[PDB]
Structure formats: C-alpha cells, structure tokens
Amino acid sequence: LALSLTADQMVSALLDAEPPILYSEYPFSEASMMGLLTNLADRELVHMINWAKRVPGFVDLTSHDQVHLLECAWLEILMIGLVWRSMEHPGKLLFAPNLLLDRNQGKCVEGMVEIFDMLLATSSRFRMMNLQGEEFVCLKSIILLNSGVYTSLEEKDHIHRVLDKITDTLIHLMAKAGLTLQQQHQRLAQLLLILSHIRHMSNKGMEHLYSMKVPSYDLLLEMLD
Amino acid sequence: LALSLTADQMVSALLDAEPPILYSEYDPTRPFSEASMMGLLTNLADRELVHMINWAKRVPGFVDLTSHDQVHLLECAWLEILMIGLVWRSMEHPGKLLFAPNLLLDRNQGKCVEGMVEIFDMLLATSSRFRMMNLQGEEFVCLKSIILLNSGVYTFTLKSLEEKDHIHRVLDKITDTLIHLMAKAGLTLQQQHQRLAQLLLILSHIRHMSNKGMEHLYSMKVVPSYDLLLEMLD
Numbered sequence: 443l444a445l446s447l448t449a450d451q452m453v454s455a456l457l458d459a460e461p462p463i464l465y466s467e468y469p470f471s472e473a474s475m476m477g478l479l480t481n482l483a484d485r486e487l488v489h490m491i492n493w494a495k496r497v498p499g500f501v502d503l504t505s506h507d508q509v510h511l512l513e514c515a516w517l518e519i520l521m522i523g524l525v526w527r528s529m530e531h532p533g534k535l536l537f538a539p540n541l542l543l544d545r546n547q548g549k550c551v552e553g554m555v556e557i558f559d560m561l562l563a564t565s566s567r568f569r570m571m572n573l574q575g576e577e578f579v580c581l582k583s584i585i586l587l588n589s590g591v592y593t594s595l596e597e598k599d600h601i602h603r604v605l606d607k608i609t610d611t612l613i614h615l616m617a618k619a620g621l622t623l624q625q626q627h628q629r630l631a632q633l634l635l636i637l638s639h640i641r642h643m644s645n646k647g648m649e650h651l652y653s654m655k656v657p658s659y660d661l662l663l664e665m666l667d
Numbered sequence: 668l669a670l671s672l673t674a675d676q677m678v679s680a681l682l683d684a685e686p687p688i689l690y691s692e693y694d695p696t697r698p699f700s701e702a703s704m705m706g707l708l709t710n711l712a713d714r715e716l717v718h719m720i721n722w723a724k725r726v727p728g729f730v731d732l733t734s735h736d737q738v739h740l741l742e743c744a745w746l747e748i749l750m751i752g753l754v755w756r757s758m759e760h761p762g763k764l765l766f767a768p769n770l771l772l773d774r775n776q777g778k779c780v781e782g783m784v785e786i787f788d789m790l791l792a793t794s795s796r797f798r799m800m801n802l803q804g805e806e807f808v809c810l811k812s813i814i815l816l817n818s819g820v821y822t823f824t825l826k827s828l829e830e831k832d833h834i835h836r837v838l839d840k841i842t843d844t845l846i847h848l849m850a851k852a853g854l855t856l857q858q859q860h861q862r863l864a865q866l867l868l869i870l871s872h873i874r875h876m877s878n879k880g881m882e883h884l885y886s887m888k889v890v891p892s893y894d895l896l897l898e899m900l901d
C-alpha cells in the first residue's frame with residue numbers, strides 16, 4: 443500500500459502525522475535550563491513515537507526494527523524540528539513559543555553554546571534554501587528510516603524502497619514548484635547533504651548529554667505498543 | 668577555475684587527483700597487541716594524511732578558498748575521507764578491511780583494540796552497501812570530494828558568504844557530474860534521482876562512523892591540529 447502511494451499521497455499522510463508545537467514552563471545556569479530542555483524533549487518524545495507509526499512503511503517493519511530506527515534517530519528528529527521552527531527567528535532557537543533562546547544564552551550551560559551554534563547555522567541554511575513544510579516532512583522521514591537502516595535483508599529492501607518513494611516525492615514537489623531537472627537534482631542533493639550536518643549535531647549532542655549525566659531500547663519498546 | 672569544467676572534465680581531474688595506495692610498515696612483530704596495531708594504523712593514517720592535502724588542493728574549487736577555510740574543511744573532513752578511502756578499497760574483500768595491500772584485517776583482528784570492533788563492523792557494513800550498489804570509481808571520487816566541501820561548510824561577513832556560496836556552486840557542479848555519469852551509463856531520470864539520493868544518505872553514516880572514530884581515538888588518548896594542517900597546506 444505505502445509502496446503504491448503518489449507524491450501527493452505521501453505528502454498528505456506526512457503533513458497529517460505532524461506532532462503539535464509544545465510549550466516550556468519558564469535567570470538560568472546549569473540545572474534549570476537543562477531542566478526545561480530535558481522536560482520539553484521528553485514530552486516531544488511521546489508525540490514522536492505516534493508520528494513515526496504514521497510514516498508510510500514504518501509500521502510494516504518489526505517492533506525490534508521500529509525501536510532501533512527510533513533509538514538512533516530521536517535526537518536528529520528533535521533537532522530538525524527545532525531548526526525548522528527557528529527558520530523565521532534569525533539568530534535564535536524556538537524551543538517552544540514561550541522559550542525563544544539567544545546564541546548568547548547557550549553560555550548558561552557548558553558545552554551547549556557549540557550545539558546552539560551548529561543549530562542556528564542549520565536554521566539559516568533552511569531559510570536561504572526557502573525549505574517548504576512539505577520538504578521538511580519528507581526529510582524528517584528520511585532521517586527516521588535512514589539513521590539505523592545499516593545494522594533482516596527483506597526489512598532493508600523495504601526501507602530502501604520507502605526511501606526511493608520519498609526521493610520521488612521530493613522530486614515531484616520541486617517539479618510542481620516549477621524547477622528544471624538540473625535544479626531538481628541539485629536541490630535534492632542540497633537537502634540530503636544537510637542531513638550529514640544534522641547527523642553530526644546529533645552525535646555531538648549525545649556526547650554533550652553524557653557530560654551532563656539517553657533512552658534505552660526497553661524505553662521505546664513499551665511506548666510503540 | 669572549477670565552474671568552467673564539463674562533467675567529463677570534472678571527473679577527469681578527480682580521477683587524476685587520487686592519492687596512491689600506501690603500505691603499512693613491512694614485517695612488524697606478528698601478531699599485534701593493541702598498542703602496536705594502533706601504532707601501525709596511526710603511522711599509516713599520518714602518511715595517508717600528507718597525500719590527502721596534495722589531493723585536496725587538486726579538488727576543483729578548494730584552492731579558490733582561503734587557507735583558514737581550506738584547513739577548516741580538512742579539520743572537519745579528514746577522518747570521513749580516510750574512512751571512505753578504506754571502505755572503497757575494502758569493497759572486493761567481503762568481511763575484510765584492506766587498510767593497506769599488506770594490512771588486510773577481518774572483524775576478529777578488530778577485537779584486538781578495545782572499542783575498535785564496533786567501528787570496524789560499521790566500516791564493514793558500509794563497504795558491503797557500496798558492493799551491493801556497485802559503486803563506480805567515477806562516483807566514488809565525486810562522493811570523496813563532496814565530503815571535503817560539505818562537512819565543514821555549515822560551521823563557517825561578505826567574505827565567507829562568497830566562500831559558502833562558491834562551495835555550494837562547486838557542490839552543485841559535483842551533483843551535475845554525478846547525474847551525467849548515471850545518465851551516461853543509461854539509468855532513467857527516476858533511477859538517476861533514486862541513486863543520487865542513496866549515495867548521499869550513505870554520507871550521513873560516514874559522518875556517524877567519523878564521529879564514533881574521533882570519540883574512540885580520544886578514549887584511547889593524537890589527531891591532526893589546525894596549525895599542523897596549515898603547515899602541510901603551504
């Protein structure tokens with residue numbers, strides 16, 4: 443079914459599964475800032491699982507594989523969401539509508555400034571590319587399906603065919619927007635290369651969270667069913 | 668001078684710029700303890716590093732960049748570049764990493780350094796994913812140049828805008844070069860877009876492998892510095 447969808451259908455279904463925008467509870471210094479960001483992360487996580495179950499192909503996977511994809515992707519997903527929300531607040535991060543934070547407020551946590559700077563830089567790149575909400579939902583799905591695909595064979599083929607239809611979906615949006623074939627191939631490549639930076643940011647994030655002192659498999663295991 | 672090149676001229680130059688395959692020190696005490704194996708691999712990577720600078724200066728667009736921006740891209744890319752280099756030459760050796768023609772190691776020799784085996788298994792999966800897709804040399808040299816230009820572009824006044832848009836124009840030129848190679852080979856436009864996307868999604872795991880590698884190199888306890896790379900650049 444999910445392999446037999448048009449560009450239009452894939453977009454619609456993803457536009458439909460989008461979690462809602464959440465609110466914080468808001469000086470700071472290490473403890474509270476982390477507090478507010480931790481809690482909001484944890485609430486966003488709950489909505490993430492129900493969003494993933496609505497990504498075409500995802501539910502056709504085993505619960506083992508669903509869980510692994512999520513334990514590898516969860517912080518890339520949070521981060522592309524933040525970056526997407528921040529696109530029209532140049533030089534700030536819209537954590538929540540009541541928590542819009544400055545490059546300068548990263549200094550309130552040791553090691554966080556660097557992760558704000560990365561994030562702000564991805565936001566500006568989205569703004570300059572005029573990233574569309576339809577392109578956003580496709581990329582957030584690419585991340586979900588792609589960040590642990592390389593780790594049975596039947597499952598790998600299914601994920602790779604889903605990702606083929608999201609490529610088609612991404613190309614269709616750009617053709618409908620009226621881009622040339624050269625402009626289409628180019629914009630496809632620009633958006634998928636930003637995923638390597640988001641992967642980078644995820645890994646430096648994870649690293650910085652272990653300086654703080656991450657969900658296990660059992661965590662997500664229970665939450666899917 | 669990189670925006671003048673046709674697809675074929677961009678491929679020609681990238682093939683021509685390729686570093687040679689180096690050997691590991693010949694007849695070290697066999698078998699290895701963790702230390703001596705880490706000495707062999709470090710000795711080899713540090714030698715590969717010198718050739719990588721020479722290779723980097725022949726990637727079209729790279730010498731148009733300031734020396735500061737040139738070293739920033741190498742700071743950010745060097746381990747992803749060594750790693751894609753490893754997975755390509757490892758392709759035709761299922762379950763084996765061809766570090767050198769004289770240093771061919773399977774998963775189990777990876778266990779001889781604590782933490783190395785996880786990163787080993789990732790490098791092995793990636794080489795298999797390359798085999799599975801029948802990655803071509805012309806494509807490989809396009810991916811290796813994309814890592815150099817892309818990895819550090821996101822962490823750069825009018826100056827460094829023209830550097831960031833120039834890097835992006837070059838990257839757009841390498842994308843076109845990849846499509847041309849696929850269209851030339853007889854792939855449909857659809858298959859052309861699909862194969863471009865799967866090649867670029869693999870760059871995201873290579874970044875992952877790179878950050879895990881750097882994590883592991885730190886754990887053990889050194890890596891290229893800024894100044895060092897500045898020196899080799901000139």
Ligand SMILES: C[C@@H]1Cc2c([nH]c3ccccc23)[C@@H](c2c(F)cc(NC3CN(CCCF)C3)cc2F)N1CC(F)(F)CO
Pocket residue numbers: 476479480482483484486517520521523524537553554557558646647648650651656657
């Ligand atoms: C700035 C980034 C990105 C980010 C954080 N909060 C968010 C809320 C909504 C959307 C995005 C974010 C925040 C963030 C986060 F992303 C997760 C957590 N930790 C909690 C995730 N929890 C799950 C396990 C609970 F037991 C631990 C704390 C944060 F400050 N994060 C920091 C970092 F992870 F990159 C480390 O520097």
Ligand SMILES: CC1=C(c2cccc(O)c2)[C@H](c2ccc(I)cc2)Oc2ccc(O)cc21
Pocket residue numbers: 708709711712713715749750752753766783786787879880881883884889890891
């Ligand atoms: C990927 C890789 C290493 C590797 C393997 C596993 C983990 C890791 O962190 C690095 C290891 C290495 C050792 C020391 C340094 I300084 C850099 C790389 O030795 C190499 C040699 C050549 C090469 O092309 C790639 C590697």
